[PDB]
Design a protein around this nucleic acid. Structure first.
Lengths: 49, 50, 50
DNA sequence: AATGTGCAACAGCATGATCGCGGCAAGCTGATCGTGCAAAAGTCGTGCCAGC
RNA sequence: GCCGCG
DNA sequence: GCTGGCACGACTTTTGCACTCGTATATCATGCTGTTGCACATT
């Protein structure tokens, strides 16, 4: 069986461990991703102009 | 009131079945000092000195 | 259990591996929250609530 | 002579801290409403024929 | 959760 | 003639339905990572 989440969610397995896989894949500190993942701050994409 | 007093008297850290082998084990269990308990310390959290 | 009051401790002086002995005072109430006063090896007072 | 870079010290957090066995109580405690309507399903009081 | 056994 | 299990027209019960408001600590021992402070080479 399975559950459709209707909203993307993060895997605590990879987000929260001392060598954070997603954190160093993004080349950005864990605190920024933790803050953006809990709606404390936004993150922008593209916006070259 | 009744729930709190019964919960303490029946199901608590320091209210245990009294041993009944001989009168000696009874009398020993009655006058016992336990360092554990609610406001006390846990087994794994005690060092050599205690 | 520990009688409520004031207790000074020395942590045996092996915390920062510099040989500097750190003294900490602690106020334990019968019911409430404790107070800690601790020393930073740079010789700075510090207070710890709860 | 003022300046940018790489190295090191201090704080916070994750991890694990023996193996079997026996016995006794108490928690183990655990619920999302109604909604009001068709739509369906089921049920009940009643009448039916077939066996003795 | 507690107590004990080697 | 006497009796004892089968169907029918009202009544009665269930069910999707998906729709909103609504009290505590005190084990050390170790390793790893991140932030900040400081010595050294540079124009």
């Amino acid at each position: 069986g399975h559950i459709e989440l209707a909203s993307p969610t993060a895997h605590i397995w990879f987000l929260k461990s001392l060598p954070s896989r997603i954190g160093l894949l993004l080349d950005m500190p864990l605190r920024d991703i933790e803050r953006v993942l809990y709606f404390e701050s936004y993150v922008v994409i593209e916006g070259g102009m | 009131i009744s729930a709190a007093v019964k919960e303490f008297f029946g199901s608590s850290q320091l209210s245990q079945f009294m041993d009944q082998n001989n009168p000696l084990s009874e009398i020993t269990h009655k006058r016992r000092i336990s360092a554990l308990g609610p406001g006390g310390l846990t087994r794994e959290r005690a060092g050599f000195e205690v | 259990h520990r009688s409520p009051g004031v207790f000074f401790d020395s942590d045996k002086g092996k915390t920062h591996s510099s040989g500097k002995v750190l003294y900490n005072a602690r106020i334990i109430p019968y019911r409430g929250s404790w107070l800690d006063f601790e020393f930073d090896p740079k010789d700075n007072l510090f207070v710890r609530i709860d």
